[PDB]
Tab-separated table of C-alpha atoms in Angstrom:
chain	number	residue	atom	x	y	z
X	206	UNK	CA	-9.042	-171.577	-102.287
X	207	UNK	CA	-9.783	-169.307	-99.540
X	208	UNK	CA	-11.054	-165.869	-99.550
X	209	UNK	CA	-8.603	-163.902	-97.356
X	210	UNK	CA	-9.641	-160.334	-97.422
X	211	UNK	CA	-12.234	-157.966	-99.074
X	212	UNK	CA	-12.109	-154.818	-100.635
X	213	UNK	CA	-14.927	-152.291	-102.329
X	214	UNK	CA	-13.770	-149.240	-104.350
X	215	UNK	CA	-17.071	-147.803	-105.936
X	216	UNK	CA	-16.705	-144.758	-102.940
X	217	UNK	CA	-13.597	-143.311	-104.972
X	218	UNK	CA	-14.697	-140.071	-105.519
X	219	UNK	CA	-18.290	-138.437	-104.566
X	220	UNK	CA	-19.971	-135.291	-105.970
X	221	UNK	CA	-22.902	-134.497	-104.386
X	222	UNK	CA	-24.701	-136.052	-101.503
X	223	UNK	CA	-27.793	-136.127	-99.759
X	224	UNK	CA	-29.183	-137.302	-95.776
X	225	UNK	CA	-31.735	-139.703	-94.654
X	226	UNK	CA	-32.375	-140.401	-91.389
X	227	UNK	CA	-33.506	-143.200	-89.451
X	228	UNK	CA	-36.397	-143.496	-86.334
X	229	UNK	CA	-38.391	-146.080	-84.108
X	230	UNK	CA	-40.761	-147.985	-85.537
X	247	UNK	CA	-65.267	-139.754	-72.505
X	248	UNK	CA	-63.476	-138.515	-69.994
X	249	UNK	CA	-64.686	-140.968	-67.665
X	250	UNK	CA	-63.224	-144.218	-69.348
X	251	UNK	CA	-60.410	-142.035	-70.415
X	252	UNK	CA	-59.688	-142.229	-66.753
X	253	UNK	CA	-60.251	-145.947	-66.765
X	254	UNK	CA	-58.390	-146.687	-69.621
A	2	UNK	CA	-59.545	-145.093	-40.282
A	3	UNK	CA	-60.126	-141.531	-40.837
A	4	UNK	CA	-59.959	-139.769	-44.444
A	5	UNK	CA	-57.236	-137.092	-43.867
A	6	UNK	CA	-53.996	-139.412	-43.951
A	7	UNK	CA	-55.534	-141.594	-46.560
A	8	UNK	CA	-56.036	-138.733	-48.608
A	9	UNK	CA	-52.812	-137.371	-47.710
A	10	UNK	CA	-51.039	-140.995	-49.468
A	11	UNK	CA	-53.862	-140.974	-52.509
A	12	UNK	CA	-53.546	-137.583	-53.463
A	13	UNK	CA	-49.682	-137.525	-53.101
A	14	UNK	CA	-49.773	-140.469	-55.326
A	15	UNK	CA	-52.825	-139.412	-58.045
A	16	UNK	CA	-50.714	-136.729	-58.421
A	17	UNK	CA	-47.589	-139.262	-58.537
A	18	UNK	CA	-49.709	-141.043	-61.406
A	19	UNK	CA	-50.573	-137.776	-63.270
A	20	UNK	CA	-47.070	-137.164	-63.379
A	21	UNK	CA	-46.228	-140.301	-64.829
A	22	UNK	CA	-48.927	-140.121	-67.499
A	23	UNK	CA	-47.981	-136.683	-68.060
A	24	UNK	CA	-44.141	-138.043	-68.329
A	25	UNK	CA	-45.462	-140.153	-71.019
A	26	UNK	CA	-47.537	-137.747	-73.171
A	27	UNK	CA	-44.975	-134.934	-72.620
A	28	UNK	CA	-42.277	-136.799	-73.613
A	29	UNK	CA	-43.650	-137.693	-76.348
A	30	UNK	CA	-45.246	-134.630	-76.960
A	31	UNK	CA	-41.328	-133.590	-78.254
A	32	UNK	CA	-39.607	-137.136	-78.772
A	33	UNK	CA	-42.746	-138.013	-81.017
A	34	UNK	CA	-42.135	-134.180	-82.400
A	35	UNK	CA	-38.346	-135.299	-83.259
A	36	UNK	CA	-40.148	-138.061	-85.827
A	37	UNK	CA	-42.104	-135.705	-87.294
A	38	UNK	CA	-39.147	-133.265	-87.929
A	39	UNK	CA	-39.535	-131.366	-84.703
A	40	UNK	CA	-43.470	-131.811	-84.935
A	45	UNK	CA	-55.005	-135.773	-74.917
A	46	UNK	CA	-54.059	-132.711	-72.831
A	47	UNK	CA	-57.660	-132.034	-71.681
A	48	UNK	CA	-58.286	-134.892	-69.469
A	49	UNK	CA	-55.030	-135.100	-67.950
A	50	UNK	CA	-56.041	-131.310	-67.320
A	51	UNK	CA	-59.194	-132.575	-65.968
A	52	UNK	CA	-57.359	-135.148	-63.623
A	53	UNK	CA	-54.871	-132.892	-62.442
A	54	UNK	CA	-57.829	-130.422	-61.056
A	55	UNK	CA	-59.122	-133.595	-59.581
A	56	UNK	CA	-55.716	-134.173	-57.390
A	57	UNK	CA	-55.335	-130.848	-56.221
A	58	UNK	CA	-58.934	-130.167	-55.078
A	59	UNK	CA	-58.901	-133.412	-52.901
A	60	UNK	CA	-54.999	-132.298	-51.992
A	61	UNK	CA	-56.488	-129.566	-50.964
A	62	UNK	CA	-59.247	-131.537	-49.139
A	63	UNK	CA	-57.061	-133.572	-47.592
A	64	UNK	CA	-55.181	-131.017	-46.150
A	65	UNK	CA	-58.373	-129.815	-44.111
A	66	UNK	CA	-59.264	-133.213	-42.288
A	67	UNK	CA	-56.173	-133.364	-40.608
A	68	UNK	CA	-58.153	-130.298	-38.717
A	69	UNK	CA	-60.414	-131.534	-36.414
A	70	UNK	CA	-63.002	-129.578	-34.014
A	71	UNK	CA	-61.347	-129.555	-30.835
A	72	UNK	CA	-62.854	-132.304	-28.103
A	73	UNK	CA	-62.370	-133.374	-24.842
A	74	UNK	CA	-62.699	-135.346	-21.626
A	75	UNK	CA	-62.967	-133.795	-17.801
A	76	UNK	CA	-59.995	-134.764	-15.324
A	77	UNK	CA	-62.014	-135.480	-12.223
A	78	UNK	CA	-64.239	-137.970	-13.670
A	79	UNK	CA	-63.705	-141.542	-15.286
A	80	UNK	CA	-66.587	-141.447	-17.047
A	81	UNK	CA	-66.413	-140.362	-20.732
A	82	UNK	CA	-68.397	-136.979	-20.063
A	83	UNK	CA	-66.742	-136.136	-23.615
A	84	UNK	CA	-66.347	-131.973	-23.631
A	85	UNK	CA	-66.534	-130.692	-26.856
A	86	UNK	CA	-66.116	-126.821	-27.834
A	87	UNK	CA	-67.450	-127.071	-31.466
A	88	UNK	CA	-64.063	-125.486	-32.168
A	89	UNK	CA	-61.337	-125.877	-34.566
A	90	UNK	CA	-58.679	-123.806	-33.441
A	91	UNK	CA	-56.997	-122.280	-29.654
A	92	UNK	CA	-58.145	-118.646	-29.277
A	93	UNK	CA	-55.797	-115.982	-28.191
A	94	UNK	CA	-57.891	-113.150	-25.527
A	95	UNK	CA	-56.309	-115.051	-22.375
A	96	UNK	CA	-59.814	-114.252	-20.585
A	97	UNK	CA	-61.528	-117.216	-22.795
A	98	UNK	CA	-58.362	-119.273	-23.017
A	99	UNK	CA	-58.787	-118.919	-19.316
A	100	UNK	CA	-62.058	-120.526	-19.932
A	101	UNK	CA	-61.042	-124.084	-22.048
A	102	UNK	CA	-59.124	-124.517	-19.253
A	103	UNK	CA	-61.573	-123.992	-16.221
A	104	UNK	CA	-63.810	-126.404	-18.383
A	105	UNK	CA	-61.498	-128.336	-17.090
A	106	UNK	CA	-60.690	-128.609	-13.051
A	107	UNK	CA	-57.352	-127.499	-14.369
A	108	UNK	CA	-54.850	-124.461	-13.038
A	109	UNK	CA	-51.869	-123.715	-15.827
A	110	UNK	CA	-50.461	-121.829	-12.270
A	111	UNK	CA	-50.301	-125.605	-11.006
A	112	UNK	CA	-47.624	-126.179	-8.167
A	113	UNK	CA	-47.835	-122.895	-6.645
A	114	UNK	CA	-51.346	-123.232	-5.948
A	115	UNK	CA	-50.872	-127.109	-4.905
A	116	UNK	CA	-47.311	-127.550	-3.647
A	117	UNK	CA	-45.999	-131.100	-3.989
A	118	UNK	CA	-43.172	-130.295	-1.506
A	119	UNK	CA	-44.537	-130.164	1.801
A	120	UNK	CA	-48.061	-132.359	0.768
A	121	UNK	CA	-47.071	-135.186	-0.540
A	122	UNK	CA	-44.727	-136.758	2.526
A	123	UNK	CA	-47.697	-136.642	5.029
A	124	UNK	CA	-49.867	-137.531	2.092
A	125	UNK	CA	-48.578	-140.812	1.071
A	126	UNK	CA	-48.505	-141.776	4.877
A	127	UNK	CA	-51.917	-140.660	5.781
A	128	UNK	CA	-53.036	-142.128	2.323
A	129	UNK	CA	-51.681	-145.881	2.961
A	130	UNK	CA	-53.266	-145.433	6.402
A	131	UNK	CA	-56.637	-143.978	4.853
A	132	UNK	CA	-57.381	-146.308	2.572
A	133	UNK	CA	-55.872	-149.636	4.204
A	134	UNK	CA	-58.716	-148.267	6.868
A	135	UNK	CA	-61.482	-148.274	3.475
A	136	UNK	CA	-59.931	-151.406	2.332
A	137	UNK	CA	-63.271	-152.485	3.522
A	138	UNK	CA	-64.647	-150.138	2.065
């Protein structure tokens, strides 16, 4: 048989929560460089 | 080539570069800061005093003592006045001008009108005579 659709109920009901967050990844040669 | 005009393009665009290394740094100086949860100035210091001194410079060489040629002669006979600038007591002034065989008065004192019909007539005439000459 086929599967025709999907469906997740764990999310039902949330208490307390919490955030993460997501990001990228001398003077003379200085000069040079 | 003189230096004034190529340090006129070099230091527009040194200074063009420090911005864009200082668009780098300083922009992520507080995009970087974002990462660290709103968290090499010296020689970009250093380079930036560079630019503006030879701005500075190259503002200067686009003043150039003051030199000259006489009108009378076709020689070179370069006149120079060791000067920079145009001076303002109109008894000097006066004088850059008699260095040359010059009159600001001009046509009142020569008066194209009433010379130059004979002249050009008498002039053809003159010189077809030192033609062989």
């Amino acid at each position: 048989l086929i599967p025709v659709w999907q469906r997740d109920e764990w999310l039902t009901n949330v208490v307390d929560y919490a955030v993460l967050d997501v990001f990228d990844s001398s003077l003379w040669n200085a000069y040079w460089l | 080539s003189f230096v004034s005009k190529l340090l006129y393009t070099v230091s527009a665009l040194v200074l063009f570069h420090s911005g864009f290394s200082s668009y780098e740094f300083h922009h992520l100086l507080k995009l970087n800061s974002l990462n660290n949860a709103q968290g090499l100035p010296k020689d970009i210091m250093y380079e930036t005093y560079a630019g503006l001194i030879l701005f500075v410079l190259a503002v200067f060489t686009s003043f150039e003592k003051l030199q000259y040629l006489p009108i009378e002669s076709n020689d070179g006979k370069i006149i120079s006045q060791g000067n920079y600038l145009k001076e303002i007591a109109l008894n000097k002034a006066t004088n850059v001008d008699n260095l040359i065989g010059s009159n600001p008065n001009g046509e009142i004192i020569f008066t194209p009108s009433f010379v130059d019909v004979h002249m050009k007539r008498k002039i053809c005439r003159e010189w077809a005579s030192n033609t062989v000459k």
